[PDB]
Design a protein around this ligand. Structure first.
Ligand SMILES: Nc1ncnc2c1ncn2[C@@H]1O[C@H](COP(=O)(O)OP(=O)(O)O)[C@@H](O)[C@H]1O
Ligand SMILES: Nc1ncnc2c1ncn2[C@@H]1O[C@H](COP(=O)(O)OP(=O)(O)O)[C@@H](O)[C@H]1O
Ligand SMILES: [Mg+2]
Ligand SMILES: [Mg+2]
Lengths: 353, 351
């Protein structure tokens, strides 16, 4: 029950988004972490719309291919749902109950506290401690989402021969990987108020963290796909080619002047406005750092541009800066893909919780 | 179900109980970095812990109560350890298709066949390794068992102080955990080292490669032998002698007691370390790490290094760690080599 007579582990960090699937495997010896494997597999179009999986078979195939590229034997994974699909409430329950009695009361009365219909609820709970109002009672934390969100991921992973050991929340994954960034920035958490800007292909999310803890969160429909869509149109290229054009280069001379710079400015506008909301909605007046995450954060000197326009220290996220690397992992490819792997990193970090 | 992590989140006190003292250590984690939140050392009443066994139960709880007050921690959950000598470890072949709880029961019936302890008095930990290569229809299950009394007496002791053992670890595993932090000092992956822990009533030798223990030996030699010589020469109590040893005695001391005793150490070190090269593949140890309270003797590391021609270092797991405000940086450094076990126990929080 309590025996640690055996010394034991790790779980695959699998980030499923609208456009791709990212896999990351970590290990640790003593204090410091090491990257055992990573890979990225693009998704078929419309396989995932917004945050919703639709082509269940499509995601499965991608997960199968991402395992082959990653070359890992691990079959357990941490996946995440969006925080927007999670309802969190604190309620009072009677103290002195077993876990079963506790689960019965919650399963029965879930609908009383959460908007979702009883049959569709997937609820996680945690006893916080004795209630301050009445010592005869305890405060219990509730977090619930529609069961369908969990079940589609189970089914998707199962097709690739993987299992979802933990269903996480994206915001939590971000925190765990942010905590590793400390070195790069400060280092110390030091009440560092940091704006993490995740610029995905279709979605951009601002998350402000105080001393390692998420506070503000908001999301705009801004993304790197708009850059891709512009590259497609000007040069007559498919979505596949446009994405490749951004990293590979090769596009003619007018690209920087006509396409990339206007997109960069749009990125700056989006970041600026997003940051305005946060200062307005709290006691915080400024942030110590801005951290750029997502694939679009790899755009050359995007950090410098944001830095000059806003006046706030801005850097591209690299959680793997102080990490050891497996010989199978290419340092160049990982470094170029580092900001897009913040979620995948945080998911893998759940293994060490 | 158990799958769910819609809610996010637990640190445990490292409680090292030896023959002479109780040592507490509390760690916190920020990303990869470790921070020392609290620590304290409390002497034990004599004959409260003999060898590796707790005899005077209330005496330990009292020491635990007082070590809590000194450390000033709010934590009530802890990790304690049993000696590896009380732990039997073996891999057996079991039937496949049995659930975890199902397996727990069948272990009871089969325990009798493979573990030395009586059925009624055995505590068993197990882990499924995977399918058996001998027969795929069966699975390999790792077993680790100790007499239940070892677990029960420590629970009862912690309970007298209002603490609870969340995990019953093994000393050797704790040493490993703590030793991997050393590597940062030695640089950088630990890659073979011998760890010499010199306690009050006992000295223990262990060797580690790329982060893993390989060898173990022990002897009744310790700093108490030094204390006892001090007691006799100047008619001072064990408390006085131990205090005088750290505080610093008539000039006579250095030549008549201190120097001989160091000589007694280096010989006891020399004999023990010879067997490892004799009983294994490895022919050279890269470094000797001194641990235990007696390892804090000035220039003892250097004296051992010369006589054995092997790089010698005094352990300090907290070298790269951050410190909480209430922790004294100076006192911790002085006590660091004696806190390797307590440190390793606290690290189990993050395991
Ligand atoms: N090196 C790069 N330079 C510019 N854009 C990139 C680079 N790498 C990836 N991107 C862009 O990032 C977008 C997706 O990033 P990512 O955040 O990983 O996906 P998601 O939005 O699903 O989280 C894609 O539109 C891609 O064009
Ligand atoms: N600074 C020091 N200088 C010399 N001897 C010390 C010092 N600190 C502790 N000791 C000796 O080390 C012994 C403590 O051993 P320790 O490893 O803490 O106990 P245990 O055997 O329970 O692990 C005491 O007998 C003490 O005499
Ligand atoms: Mg994303
Ligand atoms: Mg000891």
């Amino acid at each position: 029950h309590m025996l640690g007579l055996i010394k034991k582990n790790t779980l695959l960090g699998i980030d499923i988004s609208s456009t791709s699937v990212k896999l990351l495997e970590l290990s640790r010896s003593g204090g410091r972490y090491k990257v055992e494997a990573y890979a990225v597999e693009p998704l078929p179009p419309n396989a995932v719309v917004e945050k919703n999986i639709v082509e269940l078979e499509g995601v499965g195939q991608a997960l199968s291919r991402v395992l082959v590229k990653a070359k890992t034997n691990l079959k357990s994974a941490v996946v995440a749902v969006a925080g927007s699909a999670v309802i969190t409430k604190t309620i009072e329950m009677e103290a002195g109950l077993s876990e079963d009695e506790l689960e019965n009361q919650l399963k029965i009365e879930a609908d009383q506290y959460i908007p979702y219909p009883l049959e569709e609820v997937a609820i996680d709970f945690e006893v916080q401690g004795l209630s301050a109002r009445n010592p005869e009672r305890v405060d219990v934390l509730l977090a619930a989402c529609r069961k369908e969100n969990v079940e589609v991921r189970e089914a998707a992973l199962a097709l690739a021969g993987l299992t979802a050991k933990v269903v996480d929340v994206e915001a939590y994954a971000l925190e765990r990987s942010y905590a590793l960034l400390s070195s790069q920035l400060g280092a110390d958490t030091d009440q560092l108020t940091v704006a993490v800007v995740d610029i995905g292909a279709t979605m951009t999310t601002l998350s402000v963290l105080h001393n390692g803890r998420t506070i503000y969160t908001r999301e705009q429909l801004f993304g790197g796909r708009q850059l891709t869509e512009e590259i497609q149109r000007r040069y007559g290229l498919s979505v596949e080619e446009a994405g490749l054009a951004k990293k590979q280069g090769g596009l003619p001379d007018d690209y920087d002047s006509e396409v990339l710079r206007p997109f960069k400015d749009a990125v700056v506008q989006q970041v600026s406005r997003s940051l305005q909301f946060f200062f307005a909605a709290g006691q915080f007046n400024d942030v110590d750092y801005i951290v750029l995450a997502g694939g679009t954060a790899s755009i050359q000197d995007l950090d410098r541009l944001i830095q000059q326009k806003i006046g706030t220290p801005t850097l591209v996220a690299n959680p793997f800066a102080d990490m050891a690397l497996n010989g199978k992992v290419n340092a160049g490819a990982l470094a170029s893909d580092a900001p897009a792997l913040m979620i995948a990193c945080g998911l893998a970090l759940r293994s060490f919780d």
